[PDB]
Protein backbone atom coordinates (compact mmCIF):
# COMPACT_ATOMS: atom_id res chain seq x y z
CA UNK A 1 0.00 0.00 0.00
CA UNK A 2 2.35 2.72 1.25
CA UNK A 3 5.51 3.62 -0.67
CA UNK A 4 8.53 5.68 0.34
CA UNK A 5 8.57 9.32 -0.73
CA UNK A 6 12.31 9.84 -1.17
CA UNK A 7 12.59 6.82 -3.48
CA UNK A 8 10.48 8.65 -6.09
CA UNK A 9 13.09 11.40 -6.54
CA UNK A 10 16.81 10.68 -6.45
CA UNK A 11 18.21 11.99 -3.18
CA UNK A 12 21.90 11.63 -2.25
CA UNK A 13 21.47 12.69 1.36
CA UNK A 14 18.54 14.09 3.26
CA UNK A 15 19.23 17.80 3.57
CA UNK A 16 18.99 19.27 7.08
CA UNK A 17 18.35 22.78 5.71
CA UNK A 18 15.02 21.67 4.26
CA UNK A 19 11.88 22.21 6.32
CA UNK A 20 9.65 20.79 3.63
CA UNK A 21 9.64 17.00 4.07
CA UNK A 22 10.92 17.52 7.60
CA UNK A 23 7.98 19.22 9.34
CA UNK A 24 5.66 16.49 8.04
CA UNK A 25 7.78 13.65 9.45
CA UNK A 26 7.72 15.40 12.84
CA UNK A 27 4.52 14.88 14.83
CA UNK A 28 2.54 17.51 16.72
CA UNK A 29 4.51 16.80 19.90
CA UNK A 30 7.82 17.27 18.06
CA UNK A 31 8.58 13.54 18.01
CA UNK A 32 9.63 11.94 14.72
CA UNK A 33 7.52 9.28 13.03
CA UNK A 34 8.64 5.65 12.64
CA UNK A 35 9.13 4.05 9.25
CA UNK A 36 6.31 1.70 10.30
CA UNK A 37 3.64 4.37 9.84
CA UNK A 38 5.28 6.79 7.40
CA UNK A 39 6.06 3.99 4.95
CA UNK A 40 9.63 5.06 4.21
CA UNK A 41 12.74 3.05 3.44
CA UNK A 42 15.33 2.26 6.12
CA UNK A 43 17.98 3.73 3.83
CA UNK A 44 16.57 7.23 4.30
CA UNK A 45 15.10 6.94 7.79
CA UNK A 46 18.58 6.94 9.31
CA UNK A 47 19.34 10.03 7.21
CA UNK A 48 15.98 11.51 8.20
CA UNK A 49 16.73 10.97 11.88
CA UNK A 50 20.16 12.57 11.46
CA UNK A 51 18.65 15.44 9.47
CA UNK A 52 15.98 16.10 12.10
CA UNK A 53 18.58 16.02 14.88
CA UNK A 54 20.75 18.54 13.05
CA UNK A 55 17.74 20.80 12.40
CA UNK A 56 16.58 20.76 16.03
CA UNK A 57 20.15 21.49 17.09
CA UNK A 58 20.08 24.67 14.97
CA UNK A 59 16.52 25.51 16.15
CA UNK A 60 15.01 25.22 12.67
CA UNK A 61 12.81 22.50 14.20
CA UNK A 62 11.68 21.95 17.80
CA UNK A 63 12.67 19.17 20.15
CA UNK A 64 9.24 19.08 21.79
CA UNK A 65 5.77 20.51 21.27
CA UNK A 66 6.39 23.30 23.78
CA UNK A 67 10.07 24.12 23.12
CA UNK B 1 45.08 5.14 6.05
CA UNK B 2 47.46 5.13 3.08
CA UNK B 3 46.63 7.38 0.15
CA UNK B 4 46.57 6.83 -3.60
CA UNK B 5 49.78 8.73 -4.29
CA UNK B 6 51.55 7.09 -1.33
CA UNK B 7 50.63 3.56 -2.44
CA UNK B 8 51.32 4.30 -6.11
CA UNK B 9 54.71 5.80 -5.23
CA UNK B 10 56.26 3.03 -3.14
CA UNK B 11 54.97 0.44 -5.60
CA UNK B 12 56.77 2.39 -8.35
CA UNK B 13 60.24 1.85 -6.81
CA UNK B 14 59.56 -1.60 -5.37
CA UNK B 15 57.81 -3.07 -8.43
CA UNK B 16 59.32 -3.44 -11.88
CA UNK B 17 56.33 -1.78 -13.58
CA UNK B 18 53.57 0.44 -12.24
CA UNK B 19 51.16 -2.50 -12.66
CA UNK B 20 53.06 -4.88 -10.33
CA UNK B 21 50.94 -4.15 -7.28
CA UNK B 22 50.88 -7.80 -6.18
CA UNK B 23 54.59 -8.58 -5.95
CA UNK B 24 55.75 -9.84 -2.57
CA UNK B 25 58.29 -7.03 -2.13
CA UNK B 26 55.75 -4.27 -2.87
CA UNK B 27 53.31 -5.84 -0.40
CA UNK B 28 55.89 -5.72 2.39
CA UNK B 29 56.71 -2.12 1.48
CA UNK B 30 53.02 -1.17 1.60
CA UNK B 31 52.60 -2.91 4.96
CA UNK B 32 55.76 -1.30 6.34
CA UNK B 33 54.65 2.18 5.30
CA UNK B 34 51.23 1.76 6.92
CA UNK B 35 52.71 0.24 10.08
CA UNK B 36 55.19 3.09 10.52
CA UNK B 37 52.37 5.56 9.88
CA UNK B 38 50.18 4.07 12.62
CA UNK B 39 53.05 4.29 15.13
CA UNK B 40 52.25 8.00 15.24
CA UNK B 41 48.60 7.21 15.88
CA UNK B 42 49.17 4.79 18.76
CA UNK B 43 51.84 6.87 20.50
CA UNK B 44 48.97 8.90 21.99
CA UNK B 45 45.93 6.62 21.45
CA UNK B 46 47.13 3.71 23.58
CA UNK B 47 43.56 2.72 24.48
CA UNK B 48 42.64 2.03 20.83
CA UNK B 49 42.67 -1.75 21.10
CA UNK B 50 40.24 -2.22 18.20
CA UNK B 51 42.55 -0.35 15.83
CA UNK B 52 45.69 -1.96 17.25
CA UNK B 53 44.14 -5.29 16.25
CA UNK B 54 44.27 -4.16 12.64
CA UNK B 55 47.86 -2.99 13.08
CA UNK B 56 48.89 -6.39 14.41
CA UNK B 57 47.13 -8.05 11.47
CA UNK B 58 49.39 -6.06 9.13
CA UNK B 59 52.43 -6.85 11.29
CA UNK B 60 51.54 -10.54 11.30
CA UNK B 61 50.86 -10.46 7.55
CA UNK B 62 54.23 -8.81 6.91
CA UNK B 63 56.07 -11.51 8.86
CA UNK B 64 54.46 -14.27 6.81
CA UNK B 65 55.30 -12.54 3.51
CA UNK B 66 58.88 -11.96 4.67
CA UNK B 67 59.11 -15.62 5.67
CA UNK B 68 57.97 -16.62 2.18
CA UNK B 69 60.62 -14.47 0.48
CA UNK B 70 63.38 -15.94 2.64
CA UNK B 71 62.33 -19.48 1.73
CA UNK B 72 62.22 -18.62 -1.98
CA UNK B 73 65.60 -16.86 -2.14
CA UNK B 74 67.68 -15.02 0.45
CA UNK B 75 69.23 -12.66 -2.13
CA UNK B 76 66.21 -10.46 -2.82
CA UNK B 77 65.05 -10.91 0.79
CA UNK B 78 68.30 -9.48 2.20
CA UNK B 79 68.29 -6.63 -0.32
CA UNK B 80 64.71 -5.77 0.66
CA UNK B 81 65.46 -5.78 4.40
CA UNK B 82 68.42 -3.40 4.07
CA UNK B 83 66.60 -0.92 1.83
CA UNK B 84 63.44 -0.99 3.96
CA UNK B 85 64.95 -0.68 7.45
CA UNK B 86 63.64 -3.84 9.10
CA UNK B 87 65.67 -6.18 11.29
CA UNK B 88 65.22 -9.90 10.55
CA UNK C 1 41.61 -25.43 4.03
CA UNK C 2 41.19 -28.00 1.26
CA UNK C 3 43.46 -30.85 2.32
CA UNK C 4 41.91 -34.09 0.97
CA UNK C 5 40.68 -33.64 -2.61
CA UNK C 6 40.14 -37.41 -2.87
CA UNK C 7 37.80 -37.25 0.12
CA UNK C 8 36.04 -34.42 -1.72
CA UNK C 9 35.57 -36.69 -4.73
CA UNK C 10 34.08 -39.49 -2.64
CA UNK C 11 31.81 -37.06 -0.80
CA UNK C 12 30.46 -35.68 -4.09
CA UNK C 13 29.50 -39.17 -5.33
CA UNK C 14 27.88 -39.95 -1.98
CA UNK C 15 25.91 -36.70 -1.86
CA UNK C 16 24.92 -36.96 -5.52
CA UNK C 17 23.68 -40.52 -5.00
CA UNK C 18 21.67 -39.46 -1.93
CA UNK C 19 20.13 -36.48 -3.74
CA UNK C 20 19.49 -38.42 -6.99
CA UNK C 21 21.59 -36.09 -9.12
CA UNK C 22 22.23 -37.20 -12.69
CA UNK C 23 25.77 -35.81 -12.67
CA UNK C 24 28.42 -34.25 -10.44
CA UNK C 25 31.19 -31.83 -11.40
CA UNK C 26 34.54 -31.26 -9.70
CA UNK C 27 38.08 -30.01 -10.43
CA UNK C 28 40.19 -32.70 -12.04
CA UNK C 29 43.47 -34.33 -11.04
CA UNK C 30 45.50 -37.32 -12.20
CA UNK C 31 44.69 -39.43 -9.15
CA UNK C 32 41.05 -38.33 -9.42
CA UNK C 33 40.91 -39.49 -13.05
CA UNK C 34 42.57 -42.78 -12.05
CA UNK C 35 39.96 -43.48 -9.36
CA UNK C 36 37.16 -42.51 -11.76
CA UNK C 37 38.66 -44.92 -14.30
CA UNK C 38 38.66 -47.70 -11.68
CA UNK C 39 34.99 -47.07 -10.91
CA UNK C 40 34.14 -46.98 -14.62
CA UNK C 41 35.94 -50.25 -15.36
CA UNK C 42 34.23 -51.78 -12.30
CA UNK C 43 30.73 -50.64 -13.24
CA UNK C 44 29.86 -48.17 -10.48
CA UNK C 45 29.54 -45.03 -12.63
CA UNK C 46 28.01 -44.31 -16.04
CA UNK C 47 30.80 -42.28 -17.67
CA UNK C 48 33.36 -39.59 -16.83
CA UNK C 49 34.54 -36.79 -19.13
CA UNK C 50 37.32 -34.24 -18.60
CA UNK C 51 36.88 -30.74 -20.03
CA UNK C 52 38.90 -27.53 -19.95
CA UNK C 53 42.65 -26.98 -20.16
CA UNK C 54 43.82 -24.39 -17.60
CA UNK C 55 41.23 -25.49 -15.01
CA UNK C 56 40.19 -29.09 -15.73
CA UNK C 57 36.89 -30.36 -14.35
CA UNK C 58 35.70 -33.94 -13.99
CA UNK C 59 32.07 -34.26 -15.02
CA UNK C 60 30.95 -37.61 -13.62
CA UNK C 61 27.67 -39.15 -14.74
CA UNK C 62 26.25 -41.07 -11.81
CA UNK C 63 24.51 -44.44 -12.06
CA UNK C 64 21.20 -45.64 -10.64
CA UNK C 65 19.32 -48.93 -10.58
CA UNK C 66 15.55 -48.93 -9.98
CA UNK C 67 14.93 -46.41 -7.17
CA UNK C 68 18.19 -46.91 -5.28
CA UNK C 69 21.71 -45.55 -5.45
CA UNK C 70 24.17 -47.89 -7.14
CA UNK C 71 26.85 -47.10 -4.54
CA UNK C 72 25.55 -48.36 -1.19
CA UNK C 73 28.50 -46.95 0.77
CA UNK C 74 31.65 -45.17 -0.42
CA UNK C 75 34.33 -44.12 2.06
CA UNK C 76 37.99 -43.16 2.27
CA UNK C 77 40.52 -45.28 4.16
CA UNK C 78 43.94 -43.69 3.63
CA UNK C 79 43.73 -40.09 4.81
CA UNK C 80 46.16 -37.19 5.18
CA UNK C 81 46.09 -37.53 8.97
CA UNK C 82 46.44 -41.33 8.86
CA UNK C 83 48.07 -43.06 5.90
CA UNK C 84 47.18 -46.72 5.46
CA UNK C 85 49.27 -49.17 3.44
CA UNK C 86 48.65 -52.89 3.10
CA UNK C 87 50.73 -55.76 1.79
CA UNK C 88 49.66 -58.38 -0.75
CA UNK C 89 48.45 -60.94 1.80
CA UNK C 90 46.58 -58.38 3.95
CA UNK C 91 44.49 -56.57 1.32
CA UNK C 92 40.96 -56.16 2.74
CA UNK C 93 37.90 -57.72 1.14
CA UNK C 94 35.08 -55.19 1.41
CA UNK C 95 31.77 -57.05 1.85
CA UNK C 96 33.21 -60.52 1.20
CA UNK C 97 34.22 -59.87 -2.38
CA UNK C 98 31.00 -58.16 -3.52
CA UNK C 99 32.59 -54.71 -3.19
CA UNK C 100 35.85 -53.18 -4.34
CA UNK C 101 38.76 -51.48 -2.59
CA UNK C 102 40.67 -48.95 -4.67
CA UNK C 103 44.40 -49.62 -4.28
CA UNK C 104 47.26 -47.40 -5.42
CA UNK C 105 50.17 -49.72 -6.23
CA UNK C 106 53.35 -49.29 -8.25
CA UNK C 107 51.69 -50.33 -11.51
CA UNK C 108 48.68 -48.04 -11.12
CA UNK C 109 45.46 -47.29 -9.31
CA UNK C 110 43.31 -50.42 -9.41
CA UNK C 111 41.04 -52.67 -7.38
CA UNK C 112 42.04 -55.07 -4.63
CA UNK C 113 40.80 -58.04 -6.66
CA UNK C 114 43.05 -57.11 -9.58
CA UNK C 115 45.95 -56.10 -7.33
CA UNK C 116 45.76 -59.42 -5.47
CA UNK C 117 46.23 -61.33 -8.72
CA UNK C 118 48.93 -58.96 -9.95
CA UNK C 119 50.65 -59.61 -6.63
CA UNK C 120 51.47 -56.01 -5.71
CA UNK C 121 49.56 -54.52 -2.79
CA UNK C 122 49.95 -50.90 -1.74
CA UNK C 123 47.99 -47.96 -0.36
CA UNK C 124 44.26 -48.35 0.30
CA UNK C 125 42.59 -45.23 -1.09
CA UNK C 126 38.90 -46.02 -0.87
CA UNK C 127 36.18 -48.56 -0.14
CA UNK C 128 33.31 -48.69 -2.63
CA UNK C 129 30.25 -50.86 -2.10
CA UNK D 1 56.52 13.09 37.03
CA UNK D 2 55.83 10.99 40.12
CA UNK D 3 58.93 8.88 40.76
CA UNK D 4 58.93 6.19 43.45
CA UNK D 5 62.33 5.43 44.92
CA UNK D 6 63.62 1.93 45.45
CA UNK D 7 63.98 0.58 49.01
CA UNK D 8 67.78 0.62 49.05
CA UNK D 9 67.63 1.79 52.68
CA UNK D 10 64.96 2.67 55.23
CA UNK D 11 64.01 6.28 54.80
CA UNK D 12 64.17 5.67 51.04
CA UNK D 13 61.59 2.88 50.91
CA UNK D 14 58.52 5.14 51.02
CA UNK D 15 59.97 8.25 49.33
CA UNK D 16 57.95 9.51 46.35
CA UNK D 17 59.74 12.21 44.36
CA UNK D 18 58.21 14.85 42.11
CA UNK D 19 60.71 15.43 39.30
CA UNK D 20 60.20 18.15 36.70
CA UNK D 21 62.65 17.95 33.76
CA UNK D 22 61.54 21.33 32.37
CA UNK D 23 62.79 23.11 35.50
CA UNK D 24 65.83 25.28 34.87
CA UNK D 25 69.15 23.85 36.06
CA UNK D 26 71.52 26.53 37.27
CA UNK D 27 71.34 29.78 39.13
CA UNK D 28 68.34 32.13 39.40
CA UNK D 29 68.15 35.64 37.97
CA UNK D 30 70.43 37.83 40.07
CA UNK D 31 68.54 41.18 40.00
CA UNK D 32 65.30 39.55 41.17
CA UNK D 33 66.90 37.77 44.16
CA UNK D 34 66.72 39.02 47.74
CA UNK D 35 67.64 37.51 51.08
CA UNK D 36 65.05 36.28 53.57
CA UNK D 37 66.57 35.28 56.89
CA UNK D 38 64.71 32.73 58.96
CA UNK D 39 62.77 33.46 62.12
CA UNK D 40 62.28 30.17 63.93
CA UNK D 41 58.70 31.27 64.51
CA UNK D 42 59.79 34.08 66.83
CA UNK D 43 58.47 37.65 66.78
CA UNK D 44 60.23 40.88 67.74
CA UNK D 45 59.76 40.02 71.42
CA UNK D 46 61.99 36.99 70.80
CA UNK D 47 59.22 34.62 71.87
CA UNK D 48 57.99 31.59 69.93
CA UNK D 49 54.63 32.73 68.57
CA UNK D 50 54.13 29.90 66.08
CA UNK D 51 55.50 26.52 67.08
CA UNK D 52 57.26 23.80 65.09
CA UNK D 53 59.35 26.09 62.87
CA UNK D 54 63.13 26.07 62.83
CA UNK D 55 66.18 25.25 60.76
CA UNK D 56 65.92 23.82 57.28
CA UNK D 57 67.82 24.71 54.14
CA UNK D 58 68.80 28.33 53.57
CA UNK D 59 66.66 30.05 50.93
CA UNK D 60 66.73 33.25 48.90
CA UNK D 61 63.56 35.16 48.10
CA UNK D 62 62.45 35.56 44.49
CA UNK D 63 60.62 38.79 43.69
CA UNK D 64 57.52 37.34 42.05
CA UNK D 65 55.29 39.73 40.10
CA UNK D 66 51.83 39.28 41.60
CA UNK D 67 50.47 42.64 40.45
CA UNK D 68 51.10 42.02 36.73
CA UNK D 69 50.73 45.72 35.93
CA UNK D 70 53.03 45.81 32.88
CA UNK D 71 50.03 46.30 30.66
CA UNK D 72 50.00 46.25 26.87
CA UNK D 73 53.49 44.70 26.70
CA UNK D 74 53.72 41.14 25.33
CA UNK D 75 56.22 38.91 27.13
CA UNK D 76 58.01 35.70 26.19
CA UNK D 77 58.69 32.97 28.75
CA UNK D 78 62.39 32.14 29.04
CA UNK D 79 62.77 29.65 31.90
CA UNK D 80 60.57 27.70 34.30
CA UNK D 81 62.55 27.80 37.55
CA UNK D 82 62.19 26.08 40.90
CA UNK D 83 61.21 28.42 43.75
CA UNK D 84 62.03 27.35 47.33
CA UNK D 85 59.65 29.97 48.75
CA UNK D 86 56.40 28.47 47.41
CA UNK D 87 54.88 25.20 46.28
CA UNK D 88 54.47 26.49 42.71
CA UNK D 89 57.17 26.96 40.12
CA UNK D 90 57.95 30.37 38.69
CA UNK D 91 58.68 31.60 35.18
CA UNK D 92 61.18 34.22 34.01
CA UNK D 93 59.29 36.16 31.35
CA UNK D 94 61.14 38.65 29.15
CA UNK D 95 59.07 41.59 27.97
CA UNK D 96 59.92 43.05 24.58
CA UNK D 97 61.22 46.20 26.28
CA UNK D 98 64.06 44.40 28.07
CA UNK D 99 62.46 43.65 31.46
CA UNK D 100 62.59 40.23 33.07
CA UNK D 101 59.99 39.33 35.68
CA UNK D 102 58.94 36.36 37.77
CA UNK D 103 55.37 35.13 37.45
CA UNK D 104 53.55 32.08 38.73
CA UNK D 105 53.76 29.40 36.06
CA UNK D 106 50.28 28.22 34.97
CA UNK D 107 49.44 24.65 34.01
CA UNK D 108 49.98 24.94 30.26
CA UNK D 109 52.95 27.31 30.34
CA UNK D 110 56.28 26.40 28.76
CA UNK D 111 59.33 28.14 27.36
CA UNK D 112 58.61 30.22 24.26
CA UNK D 113 54.99 30.88 25.24
CA UNK D 114 53.52 34.36 24.83
CA UNK D 115 51.76 36.08 27.72
CA UNK D 116 50.00 39.43 27.75
CA UNK D 117 48.46 41.92 30.15
CA UNK D 118 45.72 44.53 29.99
CA UNK D 119 42.09 45.00 29.09
CA UNK D 120 42.81 43.87 25.51
CA UNK D 121 44.80 40.74 26.38
CA UNK D 122 43.62 37.55 24.72
CA UNK D 123 41.85 34.77 26.59
CA UNK D 124 44.79 32.38 27.00
CA UNK D 125 46.56 30.75 29.97
CA UNK D 126 49.06 33.11 31.55
CA UNK D 127 47.23 36.24 30.37
CA UNK D 128 46.21 38.62 33.16
CA UNK D 129 43.23 40.96 32.84
CA UNK D 130 40.32 42.10 35.02
CA UNK D 131 37.33 39.84 35.61
CA UNK D 132 35.09 42.45 33.99
CA UNK D 133 36.69 41.25 30.74
CA UNK D 134 37.30 37.60 31.66
CA UNK D 135 34.24 35.55 30.64
CA UNK D 136 32.04 33.98 33.29
CA UNK D 137 32.57 30.29 33.93
CA UNK D 138 36.30 30.41 33.19
CA UNK D 139 39.12 29.10 35.36
CA UNK D 140 41.49 31.80 36.63
CA UNK D 141 44.16 32.14 39.31
CA UNK D 142 46.35 34.69 41.11
CA UNK D 143 43.22 36.69 41.97
CA UNK D 144 43.69 40.03 43.77
CA UNK D 145 41.29 41.04 46.54
CA UNK D 146 41.49 44.79 45.83
CA UNK D 147 42.29 46.69 42.63
CA UNK D 148 46.03 47.24 42.32
CA UNK D 149 46.81 45.32 45.51
CA UNK D 150 48.31 42.35 43.67
CA UNK D 151 47.31 38.71 43.43
CA UNK D 152 46.37 36.94 46.66
CA UNK D 153 44.08 33.99 45.79
CA UNK D 154 44.81 30.65 44.11
CA UNK D 155 48.58 30.79 44.45
CA UNK D 156 49.47 27.27 45.64
CA UNK D 157 50.62 24.48 43.31
CA UNK D 158 47.46 23.21 41.66
CA UNK D 159 44.86 25.79 42.67
CA UNK D 160 42.43 28.00 40.77
CA UNK D 161 39.08 29.70 41.19
CA UNK D 162 35.94 29.59 39.06
CA UNK D 163 34.24 32.83 38.00
CA UNK D 164 30.64 31.71 38.42
CA UNK D 165 28.73 34.99 38.05
CA UNK D 166 28.95 38.75 37.64
CA UNK D 167 26.46 41.42 38.74
CA UNK D 168 27.39 45.07 38.34
CA UNK D 169 30.60 46.04 40.13
CA UNK D 170 31.17 42.55 41.60
CA UNK D 171 31.84 39.02 40.44
CA UNK D 172 31.23 35.81 42.35
CA UNK D 173 34.12 33.39 42.82
CA UNK D 174 34.12 29.76 43.84
CA UNK D 175 37.33 29.35 45.78
CA UNK D 176 39.39 26.20 46.06
CA UNK D 177 38.11 25.86 49.62
CA UNK D 178 34.65 25.65 48.08
CA UNK D 179 32.94 28.88 49.08
CA UNK D 180 31.39 31.66 47.05
CA UNK D 181 32.90 35.10 47.52
CA UNK D 182 32.26 38.47 45.88
CA UNK D 183 35.25 40.46 44.61
CA UNK D 184 35.18 43.79 42.76
CA UNK D 185 35.35 43.58 38.97
CA UNK D 186 38.30 45.98 38.83
CA UNK D 187 40.50 43.28 40.37
CA UNK D 188 42.96 41.68 37.95
CA UNK D 189 43.42 37.94 37.53
CA UNK D 190 45.46 35.47 35.49
CA UNK D 191 43.90 32.89 33.20
CA UNK D 192 44.27 29.15 33.69
CA UNK D 193 45.19 26.93 36.61
CA UNK D 194 48.57 27.37 38.25
CA UNK D 195 50.87 24.47 37.40
CA UNK D 196 52.90 21.85 39.28
CA UNK D 197 49.70 20.01 40.22
CA UNK D 198 51.81 16.93 40.99
CA UNK D 199 53.15 18.75 44.08
CA UNK D 200 50.58 17.00 46.28
CA UNK D 201 51.59 13.51 45.09
CA UNK D 202 54.99 13.44 46.79
CA UNK D 203 55.75 12.00 50.20
CA UNK D 204 58.66 13.18 52.33
CA UNK D 205 59.62 9.64 53.34
CA UNK D 206 61.69 10.48 56.42
CA UNK D 207 61.61 12.41 59.65
CA UNK D 208 64.50 14.44 58.27
CA UNK D 209 62.82 15.32 55.00
CA UNK D 210 60.49 17.52 57.04
CA UNK D 211 63.46 18.97 58.92
CA UNK D 212 64.96 20.08 55.60
CA UNK D 213 61.76 22.07 55.07
CA UNK D 214 62.01 23.96 58.36
CA UNK D 215 59.49 21.90 60.35
CA UNK D 216 60.33 20.84 63.89
CA UNK D 217 58.80 17.82 65.65
CA UNK D 218 55.30 18.09 67.10
CA UNK D 219 54.81 16.88 70.67
CA UNK D 220 51.33 15.63 71.50
CA UNK D 221 49.69 17.44 74.39
CA UNK D 222 48.50 14.15 75.87
CA UNK D 223 52.19 13.19 76.15
CA UNK D 224 52.93 16.29 78.26
CA UNK D 225 52.38 17.13 81.95
CA UNK D 226 49.36 18.95 83.44
CA UNK D 227 51.47 22.10 83.75
CA UNK D 228 52.40 22.13 80.04
CA UNK D 229 49.20 21.26 78.17
CA UNK D 230 45.54 21.04 79.16
CA UNK D 231 45.65 17.45 77.89
CA UNK D 232 48.20 17.04 80.65
CA UNK D 233 49.24 13.59 81.73
CA UNK D 234 48.09 10.78 83.97
CA UNK D 235 49.17 7.28 84.91
CA UNK D 236 49.56 5.44 81.64
CA UNK D 237 47.69 6.74 78.61
CA UNK D 238 44.88 8.86 80.05
CA UNK D 239 42.78 11.33 78.05
CA UNK D 240 39.56 12.19 79.83
CA UNK D 241 38.69 15.60 78.47
CA UNK D 242 37.58 17.40 75.34
CA UNK D 243 40.40 18.14 72.86
CA UNK D 244 41.79 21.68 73.14
CA UNK D 245 44.58 23.88 71.86
CA UNK D 246 47.56 24.41 74.21
CA UNK D 247 45.70 27.55 75.34
CA UNK D 248 42.37 25.95 76.26
CA UNK D 249 40.31 26.76 73.17
CA UNK D 250 38.89 23.43 72.09
CA UNK D 251 39.54 22.03 68.61
CA UNK D 252 37.53 19.40 66.69
CA UNK D 253 34.70 21.72 65.75
CA UNK D 254 34.76 25.17 67.36
CA UNK D 255 34.53 27.81 64.66
CA UNK D 256 37.03 30.59 65.32
CA UNK D 257 36.26 33.14 62.61
CA UNK D 258 34.97 36.48 63.89
CA UNK D 259 35.13 39.24 61.27
CA UNK D 260 31.94 41.21 60.78
CA UNK D 261 33.68 43.71 58.48
CA UNK D 262 34.20 41.12 55.71
CA UNK D 263 31.04 39.05 56.24
CA UNK D 264 29.25 40.98 53.47
CA UNK D 265 31.41 39.33 50.78
CA UNK D 266 30.98 35.66 51.73
CA UNK D 267 28.01 34.45 49.66
CA UNK D 268 28.31 30.96 51.14
CA UNK D 269 30.68 29.24 53.54
CA UNK D 270 32.66 26.11 52.78
CA UNK D 271 31.31 22.66 53.63
Amino acid sequence: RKFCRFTAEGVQEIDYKDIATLKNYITESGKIVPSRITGTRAKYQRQLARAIKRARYLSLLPYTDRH
Amino acid sequence: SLSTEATAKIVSEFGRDANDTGSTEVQVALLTAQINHLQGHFAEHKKDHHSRRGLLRMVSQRRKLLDYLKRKDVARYTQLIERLGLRR
Amino acid sequence: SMQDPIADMLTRIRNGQAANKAAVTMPSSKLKVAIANVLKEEGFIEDFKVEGDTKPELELTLKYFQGKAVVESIQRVSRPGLRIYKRKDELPKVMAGLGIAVVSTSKGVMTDRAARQAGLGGEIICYVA
Amino acid sequence: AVVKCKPTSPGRRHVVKVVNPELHKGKPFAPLLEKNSKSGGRNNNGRITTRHIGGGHKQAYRIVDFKRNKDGIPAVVERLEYDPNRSANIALVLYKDGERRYILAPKGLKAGDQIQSGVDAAIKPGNTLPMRNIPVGSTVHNVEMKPGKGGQLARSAGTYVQIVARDGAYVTLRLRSGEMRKVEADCRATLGEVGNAEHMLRVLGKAGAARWRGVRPTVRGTAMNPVDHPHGGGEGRNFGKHPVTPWGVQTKGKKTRSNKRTDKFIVRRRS
Binding site: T27, E28, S29, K31, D65, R66 | - | - | -
Partner: protein
Protein backbone atom coordinates in the same frame (compact mmCIF):
# COMPACT_ATOMS: atom_id res chain seq x y z
CA UNK E 1 -0.79 17.77 23.80
CA UNK E 2 -1.26 21.56 23.62
CA UNK E 3 -4.83 22.19 22.42
CA UNK E 4 -6.55 25.52 21.75
CA UNK E 5 -10.34 25.89 21.89
CA UNK E 6 -11.69 26.60 18.42
CA UNK E 7 -14.99 28.28 17.59
CA UNK E 8 -18.04 26.03 18.04
CA UNK E 9 -16.20 23.60 20.33
CA UNK E 10 -18.01 22.39 23.46
CA UNK E 11 -16.24 20.95 26.49
CA UNK E 12 -17.21 17.44 25.35
CA UNK E 13 -15.22 17.41 22.10
CA UNK E 14 -12.50 19.54 23.71
CA UNK E 15 -11.80 16.86 26.32
CA UNK E 16 -12.06 14.15 23.64
CA UNK E 17 -9.33 15.86 21.62
CA UNK E 18 -7.25 16.18 24.80
CA UNK E 19 -7.55 12.47 25.53
CA UNK E 20 -6.91 11.45 21.91
CA UNK E 21 -3.80 13.63 21.76
CA UNK E 22 -2.64 11.98 24.99
CA UNK E 23 -2.45 8.53 23.39
CA UNK E 24 -1.00 9.94 20.16
CA UNK E 25 1.88 11.54 22.05
CA UNK E 26 1.90 8.40 24.22
CA UNK E 27 2.94 10.49 27.24
CA UNK E 28 1.08 8.27 29.71
CA UNK E 29 2.86 5.15 28.43
CA UNK E 30 6.36 6.64 28.73
CA UNK E 31 5.67 7.91 32.26
CA UNK E 32 4.75 4.36 33.30
CA UNK E 33 7.92 3.02 31.66
CA UNK E 34 10.18 5.41 33.58
CA UNK E 35 8.25 4.81 36.81
CA UNK E 36 10.67 1.94 37.50
CA UNK E 37 14.21 1.16 36.39
CA UNK E 38 14.49 -1.73 33.96
CA UNK E 39 17.62 -3.70 33.24
CA UNK E 40 19.27 -3.90 29.81
CA UNK E 41 18.72 -7.66 30.06
CA UNK E 42 15.08 -6.94 30.85
CA UNK E 43 14.41 -4.66 27.89
CA UNK E 44 16.28 -7.03 25.58
CA UNK E 45 14.29 -10.02 26.88
CA UNK E 46 10.91 -8.26 26.78
CA UNK E 47 11.56 -7.00 23.24
CA UNK E 48 12.61 -10.47 22.10
CA UNK E 49 9.42 -11.92 23.59
CA UNK E 50 7.43 -9.15 21.89
CA UNK E 51 9.14 -9.81 18.54
CA UNK E 52 8.49 -13.56 18.63
CA UNK E 53 4.84 -13.00 19.58
CA UNK E 54 4.27 -10.48 16.79
CA UNK E 55 5.94 -12.84 14.33
CA UNK E 56 4.06 -15.86 15.72
CA UNK E 57 0.73 -14.08 15.38
CA UNK E 58 1.83 -12.88 11.94
CA UNK E 59 2.25 -16.32 10.41
CA UNK E 60 -0.68 -17.70 12.41
CA UNK E 61 -2.79 -15.20 10.48
CA UNK E 62 -1.70 -16.62 7.12
CA UNK E 63 -1.95 -20.23 8.39
CA UNK E 64 -5.52 -19.59 9.52
CA UNK E 65 -6.22 -17.98 6.14
CA UNK E 66 -4.76 -20.96 4.24
CA UNK E 67 -6.48 -23.61 6.34
CA UNK E 68 -10.11 -24.61 5.88
CA UNK E 69 -12.48 -25.22 8.80
CA UNK E 70 -15.76 -27.16 8.49
Amino acid sequence: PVIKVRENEPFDVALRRFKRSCEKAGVLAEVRRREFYEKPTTERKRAKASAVKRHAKKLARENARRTRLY
